[PDB]
Amino acid sequence: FKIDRSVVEEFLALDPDAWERLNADYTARRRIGEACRALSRHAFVEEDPSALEELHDVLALIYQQDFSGAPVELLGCETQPVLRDIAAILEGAVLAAELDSISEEQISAYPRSGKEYVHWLKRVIGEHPAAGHPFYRDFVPTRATEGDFRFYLAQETNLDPKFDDILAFMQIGAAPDEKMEIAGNYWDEMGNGKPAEVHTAMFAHALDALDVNDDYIRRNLLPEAKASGNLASCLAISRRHYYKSVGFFGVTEYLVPRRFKLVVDRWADIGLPREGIAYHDAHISIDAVHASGWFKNVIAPAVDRDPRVGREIAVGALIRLNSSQRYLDSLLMHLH
Amino acid sequence: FKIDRSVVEEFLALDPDAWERLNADYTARRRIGEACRALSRHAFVEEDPSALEELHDVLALIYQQDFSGAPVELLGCETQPVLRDIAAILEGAVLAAELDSISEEQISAYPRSGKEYVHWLKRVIGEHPAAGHPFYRDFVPTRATEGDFRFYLAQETNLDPKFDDILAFMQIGAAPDEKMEIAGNYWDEMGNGKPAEVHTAMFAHALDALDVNDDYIRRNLLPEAKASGNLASCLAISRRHYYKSVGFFGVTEYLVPRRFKLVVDRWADIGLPREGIAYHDAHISIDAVHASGWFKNVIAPAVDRDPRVGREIAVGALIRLNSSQRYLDSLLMHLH
Ligand SMILES: N[C@@H](CCCC[NH3+])C(=O)O
Ligand SMILES: N[C@@H](CCCC[NH3+])C(=O)O
Ligand SMILES: [Fe+2]
Ligand SMILES: [Fe+2]
Ligand SMILES: [Fe+2]
Ligand SMILES: [Fe+2]
């Protein structure tokens, strides 16, 4: 028995009684798990490109159930016993592969106090090529066309359309200082209460401005873009990945202003719809404040509370940087 | 093989390799599930009081992992395959028992438009005895002592200490109007950014004012209080329970002002610490606004979007009312 996206699609078509029957059958569930481990092996031991994309198509479908409003037809279907087993197996393989790229020396030399840790982390980020990737530094200012930006924005649907809920998952159970900062960040994503300023709505308008429609996205989404989106989902939704999440989205906020400024200037230079740039325009200022608040009020207090979490935060930062690098290298390569 | 709280405690003591070994052994996992179904039968078919409390002690331990910041020692432990199977089985039994108390006629006669549905729901709530329970209407104004309030507050740790995260879970994936309202409610729970006004912090101060310490809570928490807390957790953390959640916490906001006004007036009448009443004092005004916003901006738009969800919202409201009734009846009975 093989597992792939269509198999999980079929699962999600079952009615509530079919799900209950599947959930009671641990022989069928063992078979599902074994199929997941085999898919994992093809994806990350063999590194078969098709199996890797299949694995991320499966994870993306499951996270869709975690992150999207459930349809009325699914309300009685107990999907957690099977979907969480599938996600645990494929996630474990995805994360083991990220960790294979991270050395112990990268994640252990940090100072064991909060303010010092922030300086160290900013330096560690600055050394990574993703912090100044040529897609933003060279390709965008000098060559990016409307067709380029439309392809790029399609990749970016992996993260931006769900940033508010990533923050809402993350802050669950967080200590007070960290929680307060993530809460204020979430409230900013929610337009501070003004529907026109909600960030997902403004991102959607940029997508409409370049006709980044759902079918264009489906055809053009890169495997590395899928993996980036899946990593962000994976880390946000488990409490135990919280400190990884802190590093992963700390890097994210930190890098947005330099990246979006390059996109915005080029977007205006080639006369693209001023309506669409509003999303990126906004974040250039906002995320300088978000990055500063995140370092000062999330990362530094967590490290001061328990310096052992500096290692987790560093892992999550490097996961963000490494996966961003693979995504931008693949993106630039497809854009020629 | 039997399952109980201590067995799940032992699971949570395993190291990451032990969890990985357990997760790969579907024979051990089948045995765990079968033990859960047997515990369920004792709890809800036999209605053995001890098995029922054991079942809710197990669920409470699992939800603790879902809602609490993970300790550094647990960060590498993949608990989802087993804990989610246990939760799915015990939850299914808890919810089937709630639904046994809900008739089809209760949840089908509603008007299929949002503003009308709100009037109908408010009437349905008004007919339930939990909407004017004698614990608040008779016992509190005339007899409640400091020792009574301390016992009561211990029961209330089932819900209030996690209300902000219940809202954060709920709003995941919500449609825009509903999301905006839940977001503003969450931001209010977060003191609108002022740490002194964060609601969990003010609830904790009321607990300190009466010495509602962790050991007092552990000894005095009633089984119905545990079930109330577990219901709230169960509904909030699954997307498919969202519309139940909408009814469950809609009833919650609606009932707070009348309930807290009675508690506050009596608290002041018997000279208890003015510091502690600040929590309840605040909510009397705030939750009149929260209830109005919830009906107008969560319930009515959801029903106007898809009237089929009126049935789910009604189920969740009645689950709240029924479980509140059992909890307050048991509470009043223990207070003599
Ligand atoms: N997609 C952006 C992050 C935007 C964060 C959402 N507010 C990036 O990869 O740089
Ligand atoms: N424990 C309260 C609900 C308080 C809601 C938290 N802000 C009740 O049962 O009425
Ligand atoms: Fe944003
Ligand atoms: Fe931001
Ligand atoms: Fe509150
Ligand atoms: Fe409220």
Side-chain angles (χ1 to χ4, degrees), chain A residues 226-257:
Chain A
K226 300 177 181 184
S228 282
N230 285 344
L231 283 166
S233 303
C234 174
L235 298 178
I237 67 179
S238 280
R239 303 292 84 63
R240 72 189 184 97
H241 293 323
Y242 169 75
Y243 296 105
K244 288 184 195 70
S245 270
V246 167
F248 184 105
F249 304 102
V251 167
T252 299
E253 302 294 86
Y254 185 57
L255 295 188
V256 164

Side-chain angles (χ1 to χ4, degrees), chain A residues 44-59:
Chain A
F44 289 105
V45 176
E46 268 86 77
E47 300 189 31
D48 166 39
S50 303
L52 172 71
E53 181 164 26
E54 201 59 49
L55 183 152
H56 282 295
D57 283 338
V58 169
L59 279 177

Side-chain angles (χ1 to χ4, degrees), chain A residues 26 29 85 165 171 179 186, chain B residues 26 85 165 171 179 186:
Chain A
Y26 288 84
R29 291 172 57 172
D85 194 52
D165 284 337
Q171 59 84 57
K179 202 190 190 59
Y186 167 88
Chain B
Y26 288 84
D85 194 52
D165 284 337
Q171 59 84 57
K179 202 190 190 59
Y186 167 88

